[PDB]
């Protein structure tokens, strides 16, 4: 009949898009002081009757977070000192098994024509041979930048917000696996407090799962897809390097100071971690329960350790108090499950010359931490890798799997408020 189109401005309709998110924090390398103050009133509008398609494996917030953290890392290493004069022949000895060394070297002073024979302690993983003669591990590959000893490696809650005209959609499905149509959806302006924890094999200090323990993958039949299992109850891990280390400032140039490991005050012990063998047994039992729902109620589920790679993936690689640990995980994944005080100890090694990511040509010296380091954290997720009579082994590396374990609930949409629709309405003359 009499139907003329009419323009409506401000209708509830959006399109899947991807824009440049910005950060928000409350009150460190991640420069969370520079983010907009997190609003004390976080508005969460529930979208009744709405059902949206998600896909945490195409999610661009993970690809943006992955490059944002790397961009923040290269940013917080520019004004720091370059340890290239350290690339010199070192005379190392064992310290009174044979892991941490005691190296001496001729060093430039504050006068360009004066040398000095100073000594320092280096872990084994930072030196290679040619008294025995050694050298920093990075000298034949890359330059090295000592991290500024004022910035903190502490994961501060980061909030990713969409600009005006865009929106973020959450997923209120307590059993929502990776993909599919989320039944209960709500819109947010900023994501929750996300701690940028750089981890390996074990997802540290992450968010839990409500109801039961979830398990996610693109194609669980594809063995080349890392399984992202997320616990519902946290199993607690305590890590510590018990050596009471000392920091020694070494003037290597006008205004240039190399912070070295002076000496150990007291006992020399082993860096390790503890988990409760009971709380880890029941947590492996819950994981093994959901593993049969798509593998078979009769097939056996076996756990083994890593089968190769680099130190950053073959071991629980994380950060504790400012030093980078590398914990052997064979004591956690050594159980075969059939159709039907306690403490585990993980021997961790410590390294100072680390390439944070796969960065080629760039290395960083983490300065030593004075005191006795111990940190208490929850392992709330896990990154498995089945073989392919079904056995599962840990591992990871691709740091976007970490961000994907917390950005699965979110999705970026673009508001398009212009809508054309007909009614029996026409304008005058």
């Amino acid at each position, epitope marked *: 009949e009499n139907l003329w189109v009419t323009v409506y401005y401000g209708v509830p309709v959006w399109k899947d898009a991807e824009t440049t998110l910005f950060c928000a924090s409350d009150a460190n390398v991640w420069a969370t002081h520079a983010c907009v103050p997190t609003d004390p009133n976080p508005q969460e509008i529930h979208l009744e009757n709405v059902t949206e398609e998600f896909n945490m494996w195409k999610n661009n917030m993970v690809e943006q977070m992955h490059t944002d953290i790397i961009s923040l890392w290269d940013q917080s290493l520019k004004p720091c000192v370059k340890l290239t004069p350290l690339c010199v022949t070192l005379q190392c000895t064992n310290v009174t098994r044979g892991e941490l060394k005691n190296c001496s070297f001729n060093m430039t002073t504050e006068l360009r024509d004066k040398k000095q024979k100073v000594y320092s302690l280096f872990y084994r993983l930072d030196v290679v041979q040619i008294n025995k003669e050694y050298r920093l591990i990075n000298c034949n590959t890359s330059a090295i930048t000592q991290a500024c000893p004022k910035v903190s490696f502490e994961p501060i809650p980061i909030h990713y917000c969409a600009p005006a005209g865009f929106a973020i959609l959450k997923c209120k499905d307590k059993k929502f696996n990776g993909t599919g149509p989320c039944p209960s959806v709500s819109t947010v302006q900023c994501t929750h407090g996300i701690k940028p924890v750089v981890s390996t094999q074990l997802l540290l200090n992450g968010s839990l799962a409500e109801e039961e323990v979830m398990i996610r993958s693109e194609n669980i039949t594809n063995n*080349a897809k890392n399984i992202l299992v997320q616990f519902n109850t946290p199993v607690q891990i305590n890590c510590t390097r018990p050596n009471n280390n000392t920091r020694k400032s070494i003037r290597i140039g006008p205004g240039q100071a190399f912070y070295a490991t002076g000496d150990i005050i007291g006992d020399i012990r082993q860096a390790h971690c503890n988990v409760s063998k009971a709380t880890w047994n029941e947590t492996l039992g819950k994981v093994v329960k959901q593993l049969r729902k798509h593998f078979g109620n009769n097939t056996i589920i076996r756990f083994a350790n890593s089968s*190769g790679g680099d130190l950053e993936v073959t071991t629980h690689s994380f950060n504790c108090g400012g030093e980078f640990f590398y914990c052997n995980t064979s004591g956690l994944f050594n159980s075969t499950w059939i159709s039907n005080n306690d403490s585990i100890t993980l021997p961790c090694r410590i390294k100072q010359i680390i390439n944070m990511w796969q960065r080629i040509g760039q290395a960083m010296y983490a300065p030593p931490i004075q005191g006795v380091i111990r940190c208490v954290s929850n392992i709330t997720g896990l990154i498995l890798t089945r073989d392919g009579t079904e056995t599962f082994r840990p591992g990871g590396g691709d740091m976007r799997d970490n961000w994907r374990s917390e950005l699965y609930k979110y999705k970026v949409v673009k508001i398009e408020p212009l809508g054309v629709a007909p009614t029996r309405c026409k304008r005058r003359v």
Partner: antibody
Amino acid sequence: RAHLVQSGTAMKKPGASVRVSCQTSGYTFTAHILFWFRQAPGRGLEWVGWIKPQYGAVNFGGGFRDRVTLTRQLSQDPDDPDWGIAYMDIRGLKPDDTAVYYCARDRSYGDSSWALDAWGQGTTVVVS
Amino acid sequence: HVTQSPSSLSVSIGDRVTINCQTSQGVGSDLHWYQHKPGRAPKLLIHHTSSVEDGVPSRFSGSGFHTSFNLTISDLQADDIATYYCQVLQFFGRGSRLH
């Protein structure tokens, strides 16, 4: 662009070990998974294992985990960081291990789709 | 398991030639077709069901879903004489040789 160059054929007695290299060039090595397939004379292609070159994580087929070890050698030139060269080490060569071993590269950048778009010419290993 | 039919196929130049590929379970869409000639390396023809690779002659076609997949060749020529593998994940088919 992508091109995989494998090594020459091998003649080994039973019980010996063989090293197979796979030189790559023309693509980001760390963002493309490298598989390893073999084909016995008359049989079809059989999968041995893959390796993600960014960190070197590996995963094998049926039984190859005990005898095959997959490593790599990343580039360190700050201008040519693309290429790499993987290695397949097989221990305890049985006579039935005589086949044509292939070095495969997944097309997907970062992700894995098993759609092998860049193959090596092949390496014929015989055990007798 | 991957089963291709027919195992062998009598062919003539210029015909509409097509080969089936079956699977033991649900696959979805990520099925890959390969051409393998003696002495040479395999060549990825089509990936993820019906996504033809660049440089491949436009006569190659792909269709299928679930547990049945196809590899159709319209106006066959003297270059399309080889065994044809269909690949799901890591399981390559035995092939189907033309002559």
